[PDB]
Symmetry: D2
Subunit: 315 residues, 4 copies
């Protein structure tokens, strides 16, 4: 139409509401350019003119440094933090997973991009330490799901806002404003293929869902295998998504900073819940930028059910 409400307009508007400097708007525009390019790359993965995780990491990194908004960056496919050139520093710390779960291009890719944005609190010259914040300090968080439509979900204080990429103009158009997740769902999501390294809490919760004690309808099961896809489904349809310990640690597999914290934040801003079993995910204070966390997230009543089973039939 003639009054197209794009992502950049939306961020500019709640940012004018917030009397801010618009540095975050530059940051999110850079992210959007990276996401559009990654989307069109995944488009045509099997027409090789690969290395897609590396190329996505580089693309995101350069756009963020060129945003004039970031000063410390953290990546899944990079080892320690990267201190943005003083020539182009900003007030923001970004932890991101450029690309998650891919590299069988020739007939299949299932991918998404996760990010979280914290403001820099200290006044020291920046280092790794500035990215070591608890997830409750996030200024913004979100993901881009590369599916049958390229979609950006973005969480801020007003809540969670839906965006779909319009290929005809190459802009993200807002779809849903103030997204809320259902109180209780009908779908659970976890890799049951393990099932033998599980906590008895995980087993008894799954059993409650497969053989309901009220003789009610059993929960449907869904597990795409790429995190962002499962989490997005759990945000749209309602339900619970589970990645517990499973022969890794009492700390799970997904990384806290760039995979668990942004999802926890989107979930919380949509009204859902996100725990590790012991403490809420957003309350974990990290000590390594690459440290893993167990994650049980989703609809509030379903996560409360899991926490009851953890309180009684677990350990």
């Amino acid at each position: 139409d003639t009054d197209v409400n794009t992502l950049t307009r939306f961020v500019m508007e709640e940012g004018r509401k917030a009397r801010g400097t618009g540095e975050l708007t530059q940051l999110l525009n850079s992210l959007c350019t990276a996401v559009k390019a990654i989307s069109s790359a995944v488009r045509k993965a099997g027409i090789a003119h690969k290395k897609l995780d590396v190329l996505s990491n580089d693309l995101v990194m350069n756009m963020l440094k060129s945003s004039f908004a970031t000063c410390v960056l953290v990546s899944e496919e990079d080892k320690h933090a990267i201190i943005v050139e003083p020539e182009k520093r900003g007030k923001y710390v970004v932890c991101f997973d450029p690309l998650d779960g891919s590299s069988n291009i020739d007939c299949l890719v299932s991918v998404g991009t996760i990010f979280g944005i914290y403001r820099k609190k200290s006044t020291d010259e920046p280092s790794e330490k500035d990215a070591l914040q608890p997830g409750r300090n996030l200024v913004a968080a979100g993901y881009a799901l590369y599916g049958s439509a390229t979609m950006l979900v973005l969480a801020m204080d007003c809540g969670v806002n839906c965006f779909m990429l319009d290929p005809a103009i190459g802009e993200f158009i807002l779809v849903d404003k103030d997204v809320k997740i259902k109180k209780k769902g009908k779908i659970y999501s976890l890799n049951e293929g393990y099932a033998r390294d599980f906590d008895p809490a995980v087993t008894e919760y799954i059993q409650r869902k497969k053989f309901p004690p009220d003789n009610s309808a059993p929960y449907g099961a869904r597990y795409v295998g790429s995190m962002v896809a499962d989490v997005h489904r759990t945000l749209v349809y309602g339900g619970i998504f589970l990645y517990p310990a499973n022969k890794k640690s009492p700390n799970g597999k997904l990384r806290l900073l760039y995979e668990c914290n942004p999802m926890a934040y989107v979930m919380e801003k949509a009204g859902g819940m996100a725990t590790t079993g012991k403490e809420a995910v957003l309350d974990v204070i990290p000590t390594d930028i690459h440290q893993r966390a167990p994650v049980i997230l989703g609809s509030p009543d379903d996560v409360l059910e899991f926490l009851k089973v953890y309180e009684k039939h677990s350990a």
Copy 2:
């Protein structure tokens, strides 16, 4: 690329080996066009001003009438068969599902298109009864996956070929030729929430997958909920896919003619297997165009293992 290998070029060149008439190529270009339109519609599902399955059915039906290659069409969202006007009548019979597994305008849509192509054999006037052919007689069959890339998997007598949609030119490009599924996989795919209603064969097989007897690694679980995505993953990665039986589905939920048979055909054509427990899906002779059938398909050793269990009638 000055030597683009398009799907139309592909059918046109494997069809001169068989000394055909050229009607299959016209039919497949018609499906090509219909699928491309559907994929863009899915592109902008929340941007473009619902009812995607009836629009998809009408579009596919129209393009198939205009190919001058069909006489009988059968569609999932249409009750009885449609008999092509004689001015537009070819020799083929198409059993197709335009769209399967979608409908959310807030955000997520996950869907594909399935088709199988018979040749009319009887000298009667064309009618519904000419669709009731065993899957072993399919001339060609396959599916379009509307995922992060739009993909056409086409199976014929010589085998299975993978086609990606280059969105810059609007044609489908050959990616993998003569695809073959692994003999043994490490992924099992089914809706375990229905585990109440499993007859004991499936439960034995699945507990064997999670708790292997020979101390080898367990299988990972994967289940998207859209058949096209799940069968595509089974083909691309190897494994097994199950949708056998519930209390709400004594016969199974999937439809033999336009869902079970095309996937089973692509499967045996990729070196894999596809059973109902009792008989191979391709050897089933249908009696209603909408009749249902249980399906277990995938890598040969996995389907054979499930069949070992099934024939044993174990605990």
Copy 3:
């Protein structure tokens, strides 16, 4: 919509009207794939990952050989004719200009693709001689204009049909059916920058248009500089387009087979006129496949005016 009338449908329909073998339909599908690829290339000429005339020639050539419809091909950027592999011969001779007027990619390209299709009359093994036909024998002719929209204009016996490329699905959609050009126009098109190697006929006609003897409104002047653009404008708006002798020969500059004949044919099928001054363009029998012809084409009354000035105030 759900009844999209594409180029392939249209050619299939007037081809079923003509009881033909559909070999021409294969030919035009191959042409369309070449045109879509060329269009997307010109799209992004200044994002070099050039040689565009060579690459366009190769693309068109390979698609035509892979159409199973052609046996002799002629190109602007190729020296003699190319005899299609017997493995993939057809009944048709194609003379084409793959690309006309380009190669300043870095900030500007103005281009189109011309083609004419004659049926092979003789029964000799094919050679250059089969492309040496007068333009009145054309079975099909047309052009693709690469502008603010990619457009294919196609002339056959029913007349001239308009087609625009829909990027969202990558198919050409019919726009105008049975195009006719105005009886008399208001625009003339020729490179007045020469003006000193002109025939007195050309000068007095141009003067009649600039200083009208009836004190009527003078003709507007338009000269894009790329032939297909000027000819398309002359087909849409009405007028006259001129390329006479001009220090080259009494035979002009544009090549007869692939630039002058197809335009003459499109013009004639739209109701306009196309002359060399002496004989009608479509009546010239060529003796070299690369021979030049003067060309005055456009609306019938405007070309008749030119021919009156040629009959009286010329030589």
Copy 4:
């Protein structure tokens, strides 16, 4: 490309050298989005269900209001100025022509978008009078050509930069940096059909172009009829472009503020010239926002030669 040079990145990086506020970047992203939407609309001009100039005006106006960077907007298809609501009010004044030279739904459309960006200088409340600034004070100016590729020519204090639209990602990419027009050209551009009404200066210059005195080669003629295309050709190839005076235009047809001034600014910024015969276009001080002005612009030696003739007041 992992280091994409976008237009937004470009403005954002040449704006930190000047220690600006960032409002120009927001304004130019707004124009970026509006132009991309317009270019797709033009894409499908005959496919998509007229009135492109009012739609273009409304779209550009809306995106400029939403940038929070403008206070006064002036548009060719709008009578008096528009004063931006204070909640959306920036410091800049934009004089723009959304669309110029189009409207055929059968087929051809040939058009561009022009803009020039002033800074409000007076301490009055914003109003129409703040648009009446001499072109020598433009902060930035340029045009979008909607041709065979969509192109944005942006001129600022440092010079002129060329941007192409990559349609796969929906951003504008830097192609040529610091463009410079040739000193002397071989192409003259004007509507010679109006030759009746030429005051003798133009006729002398043009007869000098066709019949050079020093036995050197004559200039080629080029005239598209859309100003943006013609001025783009003049810049890219070198030459001269004329639209001075008719009997239906004692002042000329072109509009100073949104047509003449942006092109003249891009021109002097590319090392070229732009006059009215009497004065440089950039040094003209306007009195009506819709006032007209004659223009002669292009390569410096060609405009200087025309000025030699003009000052001589020759035959």
